[PDB]
């Protein structure tokens, strides 16, 4: 086969050629020595990688036999202390993570997550640190299409004015005047290096004049006004010549907000990458972002302003980018050993995306720049416990050697999405104490893990109910305490999950405020538009101060984290039960087809209620596991799931385009088969992970196109 041989490794040609002719030029790193690091690191670190995975299965099997007899909560706690699932909590400590960008240490705002494989969205996500508030309010349902405000083909003046009014109220709410509002405003000036606003009768200044930050144009009549609030910036574009500002009282054309302050470029649950050719598309895009020459169009440059002091300064016009690698589980045949075994895709992701990130700290090569303090930011998903965190640090050290970068350059975003990590979260941070820039609650995976771990105990509650169970409410608060009790304020981000309802922007703006009220300096949005709307929340809420007043407090006991979410012993009705089955089969079929048939890892799949859900691979983990739990405890038969899948499939076909229908040949469509395997084999998948079945089935389709 077409694999370059280097030591004990057979490296697929497209990978070797890409690492050699694209990623290595500009790193000051010698090719034969790089590849030697790859061989050496893989040889030394593979065993421990393997041992950790075996360790998970040990615990998961021990926990199964326990639930097959034993309904106590204090012997269950003691039992997990025996098997080394629950480890002692260390003495309180402070993190020591140096060389971190201001976007992570102090600034608090929304955080975008994007499939790196999609060169188009990754482009937008990087340019989404700035976004029109007008566009955002106008397009979505934030301003109700209620009274002549309906979106049409031509511009709606009724809807446009309502948008303006809304932005007017936000300006009053964030950067208040000394007397009056921005609604009565008529013009802007910066006299004496101070912002003064014209009113119809008088002229007021800024009640808090420090919130004035700059401007562009003439000082006595600018082309723009720059404001700050809660770290985030605000731009009032002044142009009475544009078709908005002509009918506008102050000439305001638009309001621009600092939206996606950071973006996570994603190699894991939002992308489909099952072979060596796939990983290179991802790497080639990640490369583009780091040189700053990726195009479809280009990436944005810095934004120049004029200080109130008189000088001229600059602001980053791109979102500080993370990259998220895959977890420890999977292996990818982008590299095989001499015996043919697939090499761990985690280790490859650390090496390659690590290597590629070198361009991010430098201008030609490539013209544009990412980090300013010299840091690489890797999100690690799906870790189970302190030792799996330690291993990843050691890997970063080993990878750092190979690339010849100072130790602790590769910072680590820790993700709380596995039950064993949650209950040992202080230990985990401690293992990453010199690297960690990020913790985060990922309910979707966390719920996936929660179901599978206690799946021998009994029938589990519906997935709609899971978001308000005491384990998850504990979990959320528990995550913030540990980060804050570790010194996270002014040092690292404390973050929370993602808004999936991509078109319910009204609900989001109404609901998502709870997360920075819970003291989190970052929360996950699906779109550049959702980032802009979600910026509003950080202006309204002083997250720095919320963080402060939570300090020291212990809101979540270990008794409340092990509260398993069973149901109250046969308390449903056949109509409900089949509603849950049909609904879970809906979110599974809808997602798998795009994933298997087209290799798409994240898409708005209309649910059973026609609600556009931005579903990624984690949502597949909840639905499949839940159904598997209801299978295992006799809530439904195997014929139900089958009758349901057959029932829900042609409706999925009706929600979809060079597209390949599942119905009516359910046994000839690889998508359908993959679907019901995730359910029927679901209880047997490790920690409920969907990847194995998802990958073989995607490769078995690539292959079916000879
Ligand atoms: Mg997850």
Author numbering: 2 to 71, 76 to 301, 312 to 379, 382 to 673, 677 to 726
Paper quotes:
GlcB generates malate and coenzyme A (CoA) from glyoxylate and acetyl coenzyme A (AcCoA) following the conversion of isocitrate to succinate and glyoxylate by ICL. Because of the essentiality of the glyoxylate shunt in infection and the absence of it in humans, both ICL and GlcB are attractive targets for drug discovery. The active site is an ∼20 Å-long tunnel located at the interface of the TIM barrel and a loop comprising residues 616–633 of domain II. A Mg2+ ion required for activity is bound at the bottom of the active site tunnel in an octahedral coordination by one oxygen each from the carboxylate side chains of Glu-434 and Asp-462, two water molecules, and two oxygens of glyoxylate.
Based on our hypothesis that the active site loop opens to allow for product/substrate exchange, we made a G459A mutant as Gly-459 underwent the largest main chain movement upon lid opening. The additional methyl group of the alanine side chain likely restricted the movement as anticipated, and the mutant showed 20% activity when tested in the enzyme assay. The crystal produced after preincubation with substrates belonged to the P43212 space group and diffracted to 2.7 Å resolution. The crystal structure was particularly interesting because it showed that Asp-633 had drawn closer to the Mg2+, making interactions with the oxygens of malate carboxylate (dOD1-O5 = 2.8 Å) and hydroxyl (dOD2-O3 = 2.5 Å). This hydroxyl is also within hydrogen bond distance to Arg-339 (dO-Nω = 3.0 Å). Asp-633 movement places the conformation of the CoA binding loop in a position between “out” and “in,” 1 Å from each as measured at Glu-632 Cα. The Mg2+ is in a pyramidal coordination with two water molecules, Glu-434, Asp-462, and one malate carboxylate oxygen. The other oxygen on the malate carboxylate is making contact with the mutated Ala-459 side chain with van der Waals interactions (3.1 Å) as shown in Fig. 5. Asp-633 then moves toward Mg2+ and displaces malate so that the malate carboxylate group is within hydrogen bonding distance of both the Asp-633 and Arg-339 side chains (as observed in the malate-bound structure of the catalytically hindered G459A GlcB mutant), possibly serving as a hydrogen relay to restore the Asp-633 and Arg-339 protonation states for the next round.
